[PDB]
Amino acid sequence: ATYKVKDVTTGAEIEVPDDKYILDEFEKQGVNLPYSCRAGACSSCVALISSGEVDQSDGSFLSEKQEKKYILTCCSYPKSDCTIETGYEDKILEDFEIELAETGLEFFNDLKDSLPRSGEILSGVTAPFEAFDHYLFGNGVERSININDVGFNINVSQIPPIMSLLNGKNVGRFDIGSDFVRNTALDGYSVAAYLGNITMRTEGVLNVKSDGTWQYEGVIRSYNDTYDANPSTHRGALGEWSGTPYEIRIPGELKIKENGKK
Ligand code: FES
Ligand SMILES: [Cl-]
């Protein structure tokens, strides 16, 4: 047989026969699709499949659960009419990410009939689903969440302006006041999945002694997150599982106090 496989990404619509790989056939009819290993052992050629099915048993990199929504194009034979989305490597979810997504949606549905779509976002495990629902249905209304409710786990070792002094023959008392970017994946997938990269500010004093002991004390504050979950973002990846961008105000001050030895 020969089933039609459409690609959202390139727009193409190739007739691909059940005995041939999706990548190869696309390449034959002139469509350049991404790849690297060509041996079923990475994710360079991964696509989302949103309808139809395939035989990718020839590949191994994807977990059992990944394979429900993701295919490896360099090892995939269609078994039906397929719509897919190539170029998905940079949006793919890891197993532990998919588990959190699956569980958090289940819990979100448990409160999705009385969502305010304004004010405070509810913290924790439902936040990513709440922030995304607001993206679709909130018509750009500002939202907020206190910096102490987000669930940040921030260490000195993760703050560049502090560490550029701390890794260096620097001794004495240093006042530090600077913006830095926080990739909230450091704080675990449930914060990342709605905050992504966010600009923060730390103000405090670092003491470094000749003996190598140091201590730091100060605070952290956050600028507003710009929430955009369009089709090319990680947040959009969790969504596909149009809107309007919006701000998340993150008021308050987080306190920071640590010490160590070089
Ligand atoms: S290119 Fe490595 S899995 Fe297809
Ligand atoms: Cl600055």
Ligand 1 atom closest to residue 23's alpha carbon, by position in its atom list:
4
d(CA 109, CA 129): 9
Residue 216 near residue 248, CB atoms below 8 Å = no
**What is the C-alpha separation between 93 and 66, in angstroms, rounded?**
8
After which residues is the chain discontinuous, taking C to N > 2.5 Å?
Answer: 241
Q: Is 71 left (phi over 0), alpha (psi -120 to 50) or beta?
A: beta
Strands 197-208 and 172-183: antiparallel
Q: Is 208 in the pocket of ligand 1 (CB under 6 A)?
A: no
| Contact 5 CB / ligand 1 (< 6 Å) | no
What distance in Å separates the CA atoms of residue 202 and residue 81, rounded to the nearest whole number?
A: 54
CA 76 to chain centre: 26
Two tokens at 260?
């160590």
**Mutation probe of ligand 1 site: the residue of 21, 25, 33, 44 with most atoms within 8 A of C-beta:** 44
Amino acid letter for position 111: L
In sequence order, what DSSP letters do the residues of the chain get, joined into one string? -EEEEEETTT--EEEEETTS-HHHHHHHTT-----SS-SSSSSTTEEEEEES-EE-TT--SS-TTHHHHEEEGGG-EESS-EEEE---GGGPPPHHHHHHHHHHHHHHHTTTTS--SSEEPPPSTTHHHHHHHHHHHSTT--EE--TTTTT----GGG-HHHHHHHSSS--EEEEEEEEEEEEGGGG-HHHHHHH-EEEEEEEEEEEE-TTSEEEEEEEEEE--EEE---TTSHHHHHH------EEEE--S-EEEEEEEE-
User: Resolution for this model in angstroms, one decimal place?
Assistant: 2.3
24 lines ligand 1 (CB under 6 A): no
Phi-psi bin for 179: left (phi > 0), alpha (psi -120 to 50), beta? beta
Please state whether 23 falls in left (phi above 0), alpha (psi between -120 and 50) or beta: alpha
Query: Which residue's C-alpha comes closest to atom 3 of ligand 1?
Result: 40
Q: How far is the CA of 39 from the centre of ligand 1 (A)?
A: 5
Residue 142 carries which side chain, given as an amino acid letter?
E
42 Cβ closer than 6 Å to some ligand 1 atom: yes
**Which residue, 61, 218, 72, is CA-closest to 154?**
218
Query: Is the C-beta atom of 40 inside 6 A of ligand 1?
Result: yes
Give the chain's domains with CATH numbers. Answer: 1-94 (3.10.20.30), 121-262 (3.30.450.400)
How far, in Å, CA of 254 to CA of 240, rounded?
Answer: 33
Q: Is 256 in the pocket of ligand 1 (CB under 6 A)?
A: no
**Among 24, 26, 45, which residue has the most ligand 1 atoms within 8 Å of its CB, making it the best to mutate?**
45
CA distance 232 to 242: 13
Q: Is 27 in the pocket of ligand 1 (CB under 6 A)?
A: no
Query: Method of determination?
Result: X-ray
Rounded Cα–Cα distance for residues 34 and 7 (Å): 13
217 C-beta neighbours (distance < 10 Å), count: 13
